Amino acid sequence: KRFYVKDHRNKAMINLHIQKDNPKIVHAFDMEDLGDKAVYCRCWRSKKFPFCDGAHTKHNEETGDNVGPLIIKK
Amino acid sequence: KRFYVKDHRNKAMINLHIQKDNPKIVHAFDMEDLGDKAVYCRCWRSKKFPFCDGAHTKHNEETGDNVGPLIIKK
Numbered sequence: 001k002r003f004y005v006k007d008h009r010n011k012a013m014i015n016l017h018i019q020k021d022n023p024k025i026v027h028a029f030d031m032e033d034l035g036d037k038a039v040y041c042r043c044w045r046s047k048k049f050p051f052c053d054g055a056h057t058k059h060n061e062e063t064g065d066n067v068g069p070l071i072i073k074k
Numbered sequence: 075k076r077f078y079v080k081d082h083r084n085k086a087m088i089n090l091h092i093q094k095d096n097p098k099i100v101h102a103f104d105m106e107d108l109g110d111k112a113v114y115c116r117c118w119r120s121k122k123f124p125f126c127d128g129a130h131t132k133h134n135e136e137t138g139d140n141v142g143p144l145i146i147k148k
């Protein structure tokens with residue numbers, strides 16, 4: 001109780017290591033150049049960023065979070 | 075120096091409030107149903123999640139991070 005950190009405005013980064021000389025990491029892709037299916041990372045842990053490589057599973061289990069990727073298909 | 079938190083494996087959540095009864099938040103969209111352009115949130119702060127609403131600007135300035143959205147267009 002004395003052990004609980006009260007509700008507060010977040011101070012933690014989401015991205016820790018990806019392209020940190022870019023001050024705002026934006027990606028833009030034309031749907032005609034996409035194949036049948038693209039799986040995009042939303043957790044900033046993928047080694048293949050901006051694509052998902054399953055790293056979100058480790059983030060979620062280690063931090064108790066519930067994030068996952070964005071799928072554009074067809 | 076005594077003030078610095080050494081390099082360590084992250085313990086902080088990325089998503090703080092979005093759909094927290096879903097244990098892994100995945101979105102999937104068919105490109106034929108997309109219009110000319112979709113801007114997807116990658117920061118988990120948008121009120122219009124999974125779409126970007128510019129909240130990433132506040133996250134970045136408050137935490138010193140550099141994240142931004144994913145654009146699928148054409």
Ligand code: FES
Nearest residue numbers: 041042043052055
């Ligand atoms: S690796 Fe980041 S959402 Fe899958």
Ligand code: FES
Nearest residue numbers: 115116117126129
């Ligand atoms: S609001 Fe999240 S990336 Fe823009």
